[PDB]
Design a protein around this ligand. Structure first.
Ligand SMILES: *[B-](O)(O)c1ccccc1CN1CCCN(S(=O)(=O)c2cccc3cnccc23)CC1
Lengths: 338, 18
């Protein structure tokens, strides 16, 4: 009932900021570029330094013309609207945003530990305590997002950054949707798609709890529960609802996963009468202090190597391309609300 | 092994959304 009051306050704050988003809170020549941290079909993310303060940030730069070309207008505007409106310990903070003739810019706190993905593939797999530490943060994050009627829809280790204290930061919301009932879009990453998405059903927030099962499985095993050479063959396995577990999985872990990786929506944990508490109260989470996780007081099992501010060792190396700003304004009408 | 099958899948690297 402290959770009830907390979430109602959180929803009132979200909705005020959703209805009146912030705009145009810095400009490009306030920053020096340091390094490209990631590329993509219509954008890049760069490590930048704010000239006045010397603070480092991650700057996402989206080429408006490419956004239009790849049909990503709504997704791009939606991500920025979400980021400036949410507030939760495991969601990245949007510090500034602005646009010019060519690009949209979102400036976020720099998360120096990189994607969980790299750490998982390097180490092979996480122990169950290590996996549980990360899983608890996702459970709280989905409890928050779902209470705002936001379905996340692209959970995966790639989308989970690790901060300097070893805790998770979610940065991408390009597929999230505010949807109190059902929605229908085929979207996500093949390994993480819930069966009802593959089967072209109307679906709801229960897809996020299925994806948590896939994440917990892949963290604890080192590989996801359903894989194949091609996505079409991944989908056949997913909808079969046949899963095999490594022999080192505990009984508690297998029981939780049978209940998350549940094809039948009337039986999937997270979607039942008791909602999220079926997950929080499950034996695999018995040792979890949910409040201490929220308060970031639990000692993290893994701390990324960080040699100071602006260390980029946990990201891959990319070819540095120019940041061109056209003499002509591109796509002004499409992006007015950014 | 299951691990060997995962390597042979060719989907061990970063995965894009559909
Ligand atoms: B990954 O970038 O290697 C990756 C690979 C395949 C599929 C998805 C992803 C997830 N990426 C998406 C691209 C942008 N990043 S980021 O460059 O890591 C980034 C983005 C926003 C904020 C911050 C803050 N600090 C550091 C990096 C970022 C997110 C994940």
């Amino acid at each position: 009932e402290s959770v009830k009051e907390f979430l109602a306050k959180a929803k009132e704050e979200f909705l005020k900021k959703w209805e009146s988003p912030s705009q145009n809170t810095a400009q490009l020549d306030h920053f020096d570029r340091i390094k490209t941290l990631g590329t993509g079909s219509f954008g890049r993310v760069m490590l930048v330094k704010h000239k006045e303060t010397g603070n480092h940030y991650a700057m996402k730069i989206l080429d408006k013309q490419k956004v239009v070309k790849l049909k990503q207008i709504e997704h791009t505007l939606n991500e920025k609207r979400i980021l400036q409106a949410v507030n939760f310990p495991f969601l990245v903070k949007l510090e500034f945003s602005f646009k010019d003739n060519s690009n949209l810019y979102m400036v976020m706190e720099y998360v120096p530990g990189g994607e969980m993905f790299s750490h998982l593939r390097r180490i092979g797999r996480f122990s169950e305590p290590h996996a549980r530490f990360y899983a608890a943060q996702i459970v709280l994050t989905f409890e928050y997002l779902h209470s705002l009627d936001l379905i996340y829809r692209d959970l995966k280790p790639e989308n989970l950054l690790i901060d300097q204290q070893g805790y998770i930061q979610v940065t991408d919301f390009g597929f999230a949707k505010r949807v109190k009932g059902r929605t229908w879009t085929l979207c996500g990453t093949p390994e993480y798609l819930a069966p009802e998405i593959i089967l072209s059903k109307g679906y709801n927030k229960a897809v996020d709890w299925w994806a948590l099962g896939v994440l917990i499985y892949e963290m604890a095993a080192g590989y996801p529960p359903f894989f194949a050479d091609q996505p079409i063959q991944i989908y056949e396995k997913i909808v079969s609802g046949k899963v095999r577990f490594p022999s080192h999985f505990s009984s508690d872990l297998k029981d939780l996963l049978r209940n998350l990786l549940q094809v039948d929506l009337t039986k999937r944990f997270g979607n039942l009468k008791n909602g999220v508490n079926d997950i929080k109260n499950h034996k695999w989470f018995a040792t979890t202090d949910w409040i201490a996780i929220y308060q970031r007081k639990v000692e993290a099992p893994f701390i990324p190597k960080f040699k100071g501010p602006g260390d980029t060792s946990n990201f891959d190396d990319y070819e540095e391309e120019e940041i061109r700003v056209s003499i002509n304004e591109k796509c002004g009408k499409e992006f007015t609300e950014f | 092994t299951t691990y060997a099958d995962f390597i042979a899948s060719g989907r061990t690297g970063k995965r894009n959304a559909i």
